[PDB]
Structure formats: C-alpha cells, structure tokens
Amino acid sequence: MTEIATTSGARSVGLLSVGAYRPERVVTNDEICQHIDSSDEWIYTRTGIKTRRFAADDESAASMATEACRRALSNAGLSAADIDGVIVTTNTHFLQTPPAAPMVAASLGAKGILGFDLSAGAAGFGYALGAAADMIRGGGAATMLVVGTEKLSPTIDMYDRGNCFIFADGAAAVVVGETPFQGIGPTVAGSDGEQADAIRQDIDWITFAQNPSGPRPFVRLEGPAVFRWAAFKMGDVGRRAMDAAGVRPDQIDVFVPHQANSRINELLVKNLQLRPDAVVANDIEHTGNTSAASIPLAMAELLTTGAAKPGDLALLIGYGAGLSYAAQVVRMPK
Amino acid sequence: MTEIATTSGARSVGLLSVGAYRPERVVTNDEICQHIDSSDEWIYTRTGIKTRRFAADDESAASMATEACRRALSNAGLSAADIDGVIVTTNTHFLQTPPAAPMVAASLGAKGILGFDLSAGAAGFGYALGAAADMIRGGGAATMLVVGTEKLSPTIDMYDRGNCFIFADGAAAVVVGETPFQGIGPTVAGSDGEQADAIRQDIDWITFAQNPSGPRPFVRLEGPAVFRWAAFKMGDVGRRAMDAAGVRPDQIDVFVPHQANSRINELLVKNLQLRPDAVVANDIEHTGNTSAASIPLAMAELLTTGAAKPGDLALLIGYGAGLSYAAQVVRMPK
Ligand SMILES: CCCCCCCCCCCC(=O)SCCNC(=O)CCNC(=O)[C@H](O)C(C)(C)COP(=O)(O)OP(=O)(O)OC[C@@H]1O[C@@H](n2cnc3c(N)ncnc32)[C@H](O)[C@@H]1OP(=O)(O)O
Ligand SMILES: CCCCCCCCCCCC(=O)SCCNC(=O)CCNC(=O)[C@H](O)C(C)(C)COP(=O)(O)OP(=O)(O)OC[C@H]1O[C@@H](n2cnc3c(N)ncnc32)[C@H](O)[C@@H]1OP(=O)(O)O
C-alpha cells in the first residue's frame, strides 16, 4: 500500500485589489416607472435606489466579468500570467454550457488556467471568495481571480410592480493571493431551501422551450418574505462571521452587505451594533441590486470615494436566491 | 489592528460512500437511430455506447441529485443531520436561479446547511470534489455531499447525427469527510477557453426568449476536435495528478475517466501506461455520457459489480465543455 500526498499552500491569504465595471447606460427611476404605477420618490424611500446601470445588447455576464478582471489585475499591478485560476460567480450566464470562466480566462490571455462557474444567488461572491481562499490555502493555486458578474436587465418584467426597479447590470473582481497577515476570515454560510420560491425564475427554460406560445420566463420575487428573512436572520450570520474571524463588532470599520435593499441593510447595521462611525456600503444608490456582483462593486465604490481605506476591517454578508447566505470578515484590498 | 483568525479542519479527507441514481427508461441505439442515418453497430464501435437512460418528464437535475444523495447517505450509514454542506455540480439545472443545492438540502431534511451549484462541463465533479476537500480541510465544514447530476436528454437534437446518441440522464453523489488516511489527492485542473465552441448551447436563452417561435437551443458538439483534445492532452493531466498525489502509474488499481467516449478512454489507458490488470471504468456502455455525473456514476458501477473494491487507488479525470478539466487520485468509497 501507498499513501496519497498531504499538501498545503500559503496560510495567510488576502484581497490584493478590486476592479469594477459599470455599464454606460444610466436608467432613472422615472424611466423604470414607464410600465408600473409608481414614483421615483416611493422607489427611493423603499429601496434606497436612485438610478441603475443596464448593459448593452452586445454585452454579457462573461464580457463584463472580463473587463472587471482586467481592471482588478491593473489595480494589483499583475498580469494574466500571475493568475492560477478564476472563479466566475453569477446567475445570468445565459448558457447551460460552456461555463463563463474558461471564456473569461482566454479573453484575459490566460487560456490554460483552472476555473468554474458558481451559482448561489447574491451569496455567490461569499461562496466564491471562501472557495478561492480554501483552494489557495490548500495549495491548489497561489493567486486567483474571483469575479462577480450580472446581466439581470434582460430577466426583468418591466410590468412587475414588485421588482422591476430592483435589479441591474455590472461586474467586479477581486484578486486573491498571499499576504503578510491573514486577510480573509473563515466562511460562514447556510441557506433556507424551504423558501426557494422567494427569488426565482418562474418558468424553467426547457418548459419554456417546449411551450413557446406560453408566457416567457421572468425574475419573480416575494419581496416582503425576503425582507423579513434578511432583516431577521442576517444579524446572526454576521455575528458568526465576526466570531470565526475572532473580531468584535466594535472593530468593524466597513460594513458591505449585499446591496439588496437599503432598508434591510440599515436595519442590519443597528442589529450588528457596529460603532456609530462605521462606514456602510450604499452603492445601491446608483448601482441598484447586482446580485453576485453587488458586494465587490460596493467594495470598489467605498474605495474609489475614500469612504473606505485599504486595510480596513470589513464585514461582507451575501444573501438571496435559493435562500442562500455567505459571510466573512476581510481586510479591504487595493 | 487585530489579525483575522484562521480556522482548521481535517488533514485526511476521503470518499466515505457513493450513491447512484439511474432513470428507469432505457433508450437503445435503434431507438436513437429512428431520426438519424446510422446503425447500432456504428454507434457502439465509435463511442462504446450500447444504451443510455433518460429521465421522466416530472424528474429534474435537482430531484435526481436528491435521490442520489439519499442513497449515498445510506451507503455511508449517515443521515442528513451528519452533513454540513452540499455542492451540486451540473450543466442541466434549467433555472438561472434559485440554485439546486439549497433545494436538494431541503428535500433531504437538512434545509439549513451551506451549498452552491458548480458548473464546469464534465469537469464539474473534479472541481466540486476538490472544493469540498478544500473546504473540509480549511474547516468550513466536516462532512459534505458532492453530487453530480444531469438531465441532458431535453437538450438533445434527436436529428443531430453528430451527438444525439452521446448524452444521457442520471445522478450520483459522494459523501466526503474525515478518514484515518489521506483519501483525496491534490486537484490538478485547467482549461482551454479558445475551444469554448467545441461543446455548447448554440443559442443563448435570452436571444431565444426574444424569438421563442423561431429555432430553439440544442446541445451542439464539434466531436473530432474534442476527441483530439482529450486523447492528446488528458495523459499529461493524469500524470500531473498522480505526481501531485505522489503515486506511480503502476500503483493505480482503478481508472475512472469521464465517460465521454470509450475510444478516447482506452487511448488514455495506454497513454498513462497503467498496469495490465488495472480496472477501467466502462459505465458508458449502458449509461452513456452523463457529463458532471459520469465519474461518480462510473465509480458506483465498478463497486456494485465488485470489479473495484473500496480502498482501491483510483485516478479520476474529468474533461469537457468550456474546455475544462479536473483530475485527482483518490481511494474508492463505500
Ligand atoms: C429570464 C428569467 C430569468 C430570471 C432569473 C434571473 C436571476 C436572478 C438572480 C437573483 C439573485 C439574488 O438572489 S439577488 C438578491 C435578492 N434581493 C432582493 O430581491 C431584494 C430584497 N427585496 C425587498 O426587500 C423588497 O422587494 C422591497 C421591500 C424592496 C419591495 O417592497 P414591496 O414588496 O414593493 O412592498 P409592498 O407594498 O408590500 O409590495 C407590493 C407592491 O408595492 C406597491 N408599490 C410599488 N410602487 C408603489 C408606489 N409608487 N406607491 C404605492 N405602492 C407601490 C404595489 O402595491 C406593489 O404590488 P405587488 O408587488 O403586490 O404587485
Ligand atoms: C437547451 C440546450 C442546452 C444545451 C447544453 C447542454 C449542456 C451540455 C453539457 C456538456 C458537458 C460535457 O462537458 S460532456 C463531455 C463531452 N464529450 C463528448 O462530446 C464525447 C467526445 N465526442 C466524440 O468522440 C465524437 O462526438 C464522435 C467521434 C462520437 C463523433 O464522430 P462523427 O459523428 O463520426 O464525426 P464526423 O467526422 O462528422 O462524421 C463524418 C461522416 O462519418 C459518417 N458518420 C457520422 N455519423 C454517423 C453515423 N451515426 N452512422 C453512420 N455514419 C456516420 C458519415 O458518412 C458522416 O457524413 P459526412 O460528414 O461525410 O457527410
């Protein structure tokens, strides 16, 4: 008999940079209301959204992901050659196959590197970040790209009074690699598969394919149900993430929850009992909810405005579809 | 400034068990030959396939994954309560969201546990396995389910003379957890994004959705290119996985390549230069190509026939869409 080798990589792993891509076209609340009975004022006070970006027709979750990666690499002072793997997290790659990751890799000039697509609603970034961290620590890679990307706008039913003003397009990537001190806390994650219907595609693609004369699929949302779940449960998730990371709530400088809704997030702020001067991500204002892309996009907004600084202690909480959640403490990149 | 804490999991991780779900309906080559100009003889000698199983209309990738997990749990002497996380790998979950994993978790009676969907063509399993091992060793979980599942049959163009006889339905899961001795070698993985068109959905869902009554999407395949790529490249992949695991080719007792084609796989046998008596998975004979699910399904097939024993040193090689590949040495479960 023989033994399978026991291996390990670098223990200390961190975020080296963030890179954000936001589509050109700006969509105002007045524009969104062109098919629903609503107002700009209502939408804003209910969601915290003022505007959002929609990508062009020639753009995709993969294409925006690539731009986001190019930017993250630039901000890290690295090239494609430095990366060992890419995990794409998204809910809007509109192909059963091929995966987006290998495509992104080839467009970056690193066609050979490992990679896969990971889906878990808005929690995808948290799961993907944790996954890169585990892999790097396990020695399966030294440096990786983790990119959240979303082209949600083609899934929106403009007549849906419950959600048409919520979702938007964009991508953001983080470079993950070895750092002098631990930059990514342990992953806290879970789900509620009993509420799988709360955020969904209503009609599966095959069903749609077989009945073209029926309705087409759209994103459907049980808003209040999600609101209750998130505002009620994400305080404990955050607490477990900070506990695993061995940091107190008073030590958090930056709160970056998934940008689902500003009312939920400000509720989670009070709940987590961060300190008064704690910086709270509000990228939802002109970005809207970009699911898997929301957290890294928000990290980038906090950094480009200087509201957050490199090295700040941050709490990331992703929550959403399937009813999935993932959270971790991290040191801000760049 | 406080340093972020690091959590720790198991050092030795293994496959405790495997469970296989195979759909009731058997589709013979002659049945496939009702819509293409071919013969049973041709298909068999060119692919190694005699028959394949197709799932019922009311079955899905998530539902077969669930049955597969239940059996895997049963074969390990465990219940849902013992599982900390589930990763569903598939290419045929026909919803952008919610993800399959939380749904499967809830059907199993463990609705809270962490989980996500992983897509990487047929290499999904290897990536999913590698990720589960990384998370367990990293201490994000102690015991996990990794389930490969595929309902490919509704994506087949029955008139496509190049592929209609290749893909099939089924699911199989492994229980992954701590073992006395190292049961899972290091992941060796990569891709070839320049050949993303080799195996693909021809029409993306959104384009299709905006012209439903026109042509619908189907799985398309540049077979000779894939054949060439796999037979020429997977020998070195295997060799890297074995070198990583610190094992010699003469020490492998069981070869389990992705069941894409029996001609490719037998070429890889000669290429890797395994010993004469080494057991080679040939589940493809009556299972067909089940992508993400093929390796676990084939593992299960070898064990139920006694051709393989639990504890045998196995080389797993997954290759397919996006042009992705993942390989590792492991000890057989159950
Ligand atoms: C291609 C397919 C692929 C589809 C698949 C695409 C992939 C998707 C991937 C998603 C991945 C994720 O998980 S992303 C993260 C998920 N996050 C979220 O969904 C955000 C969380 N959502 C929320 O918190 C909520 O939606 C709120 C609070 C923002 C929305 O509040 P609300 O639900 O509108 O409030 P409520 O009044 O109770 O709701 C009912 C309605 O609002 C009222 N209303 C609306 N506007 C007005 C108004 N101006 N004046 C008075 N009332 C108004 C209407 O009566 C309307 O009726 P009616 O509505 O009853 O008709
Ligand atoms: C909703 C959408 C989502 C869709 C998305 C669904 C998700 C998919 C997920 C996939 C995930 C994976 O990675 S799965 C792993 C992928 N694996 C594979 O694809 C398996 C590898 N493939 C192969 O080995 C190949 O396909 C072969 C060798 C089986 C096919 O060879 P081939 O068909 O002979 O190729 P070709 O050179 O075109 O043949 C040329 C000529 O040969 C003869 N010929 C060809 N076929 C036949 C025939 N059946 N019977 C008699 N003769 C024939 C003819 O004279 C023909 O005519 P003429 O040309 O002279 O006129």
Coordinates of C-alpha atoms in Angstrom, one line a residue, chain A residues 1-7 91-99 102-103 106 111-121 127 134-135 137-138 154-155 181-187 189-194 196 199-201 203-206 208-209 212 216 244-247 251 313 321-325 329-331, chain B residues 1-7 11 91-99 102-103 106 111-121 127 134-135 138 154 181-186 189-194 196 199-201 203-206 208-209 212-213 216 244-247 251 311 313 321-325 329-331:
Chain A
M1 CA 0.0 0.0 0.0
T2 CA 0.9 3.6 -0.6
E3 CA -0.4 7.0 0.8
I4 CA -1.8 9.9 -1.1
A5 CA 0.3 13.0 -0.5
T6 CA -0.7 15.5 2.1
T7 CA -0.1 19.1 0.9
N91 CA -26.8 34.0 -12.0
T92 CA -27.0 35.4 -15.5
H93 CA -24.7 33.4 -17.8
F94 CA -27.5 32.5 -20.2
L95 CA -25.9 29.3 -21.4
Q96 CA -26.2 25.8 -19.8
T97 CA -22.7 25.4 -21.2
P98 CA -19.9 26.3 -21.9
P99 CA -19.0 27.8 -18.5
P102 CA -12.7 29.4 -19.3
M103 CA -14.0 32.1 -21.7
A106 CA -8.9 33.1 -22.7
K111 CA -6.5 30.4 -21.7
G112 CA -5.0 27.4 -19.7
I113 CA -5.7 28.3 -16.1
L114 CA -8.3 26.4 -14.0
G115 CA -11.8 27.7 -13.2
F116 CA -15.5 27.2 -12.9
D117 CA -18.8 29.0 -12.5
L118 CA -20.5 29.1 -9.1
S119 CA -24.2 29.9 -8.6
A120 CA -25.9 30.7 -5.3
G121 CA -27.9 33.9 -5.8
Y127 CA -19.1 31.3 -1.5
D134 CA -9.6 27.4 0.7
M135 CA -8.0 26.4 -2.6
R137 CA -4.5 27.6 1.4
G138 CA -4.8 24.0 0.2
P154 CA -33.0 41.1 -19.7
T155 CA -34.7 39.0 -17.0
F181 CA -1.2 38.8 7.5
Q182 CA -4.5 36.9 7.2
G183 CA -6.8 39.0 5.0
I184 CA -9.9 36.7 4.7
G185 CA -11.8 35.3 7.7
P186 CA -13.5 31.9 7.9
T187 CA -16.6 31.4 5.7
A189 CA -22.7 30.1 5.2
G190 CA -26.0 28.3 5.0
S191 CA -29.4 28.5 3.4
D192 CA -33.2 28.1 3.6
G193 CA -34.2 25.8 0.8
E194 CA -37.8 25.9 2.1
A196 CA -36.6 28.5 -2.6
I199 CA -36.5 34.7 -5.5
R200 CA -36.8 32.8 -8.8
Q201 CA -37.1 32.3 -12.5
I203 CA -40.7 29.1 -15.7
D204 CA -37.8 26.8 -16.4
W205 CA -36.1 27.1 -19.7
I206 CA -37.0 23.6 -21.0
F208 CA -40.5 27.5 -21.9
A209 CA -38.7 25.9 -24.9
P212 CA -43.2 29.0 -26.9
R216 CA -41.8 33.7 -21.3
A244 CA -15.0 32.9 13.5
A245 CA -12.7 35.8 12.4
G246 CA -12.0 36.5 16.1
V247 CA -13.1 40.1 15.9
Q251 CA -13.7 46.6 15.5
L313 CA -11.7 45.6 8.7
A321 CA -31.9 33.4 -4.0
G322 CA -32.4 29.7 -3.3
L323 CA -32.3 31.4 0.0
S324 CA -28.5 31.2 0.3
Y325 CA -26.2 33.2 2.5
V329 CA -14.6 39.3 7.6
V330 CA -11.8 40.6 5.3
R331 CA -9.2 43.3 5.0
Chain B
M1 CA -5.2 46.3 14.3
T2 CA -6.2 42.7 15.1
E3 CA -5.1 39.8 12.8
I4 CA -8.0 37.8 11.3
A5 CA -8.3 34.3 12.8
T6 CA -7.8 31.1 10.8
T7 CA -10.0 28.1 11.3
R11 CA -6.0 16.8 7.5
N91 CA -24.9 21.7 -16.6
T92 CA -28.7 21.0 -16.8
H93 CA -30.4 22.9 -13.9
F94 CA -32.8 24.8 -16.2
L95 CA -33.2 27.8 -13.9
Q96 CA -30.9 30.8 -13.7
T97 CA -32.0 30.8 -10.0
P98 CA -32.7 29.5 -7.4
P99 CA -29.7 27.2 -7.2
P102 CA -30.5 24.5 -1.2
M103 CA -33.5 22.7 -2.8
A106 CA -34.3 20.9 2.0
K111 CA -32.6 22.8 4.9
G112 CA -30.1 25.0 6.7
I113 CA -26.8 23.6 5.5
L114 CA -24.4 25.6 3.2
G115 CA -24.2 24.9 -0.5
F116 CA -24.0 26.1 -4.1
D117 CA -24.1 25.0 -7.7
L118 CA -20.9 24.5 -9.7
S119 CA -20.7 24.4 -13.5
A120 CA -17.6 23.3 -15.4
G121 CA -18.9 20.9 -18.0
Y127 CA -13.8 20.8 -9.3
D134 CA -10.5 22.2 0.4
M135 CA -13.5 23.5 2.5
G138 CA -10.0 24.5 5.8
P154 CA -34.2 17.5 -23.2
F181 CA -5.7 8.2 5.9
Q182 CA -5.5 10.7 3.1
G183 CA -8.2 9.7 0.6
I184 CA -8.2 12.6 -1.9
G185 CA -5.1 13.7 -3.8
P186 CA -4.5 17.3 -4.8
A189 CA -7.1 21.4 -13.2
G190 CA -7.1 23.7 -16.1
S191 CA -9.0 24.6 -19.3
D192 CA -8.9 25.7 -22.9
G193 CA -11.1 28.7 -23.4
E194 CA -10.1 29.0 -27.1
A196 CA -15.3 27.1 -25.9
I199 CA -19.3 21.7 -26.7
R200 CA -22.0 24.2 -26.3
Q201 CA -25.6 25.5 -26.2
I203 CA -28.5 29.7 -28.9
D204 CA -28.3 31.6 -25.6
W205 CA -31.5 31.7 -23.6
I206 CA -32.2 35.4 -23.8
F208 CA -34.1 32.6 -27.7
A209 CA -36.6 34.2 -25.3
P212 CA -39.4 31.8 -28.9
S213 CA -41.3 30.6 -32.0
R216 CA -34.8 26.6 -30.1
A244 CA 0.8 15.6 -7.1
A245 CA -0.6 12.6 -5.2
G246 CA 2.9 11.1 -5.0
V247 CA 1.8 7.9 -6.7
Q251 CA 0.1 1.8 -8.5
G311 CA -9.9 1.4 -0.7
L313 CA -6.2 3.6 -5.6
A321 CA -17.2 21.8 -22.0
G322 CA -15.8 25.3 -21.9
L323 CA -12.9 23.0 -22.4
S324 CA -12.4 22.4 -18.7
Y325 CA -10.6 19.6 -17.0
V329 CA -6.1 10.4 -7.2
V330 CA -8.5 9.0 -4.6
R331 CA -9.4 5.9 -2.6

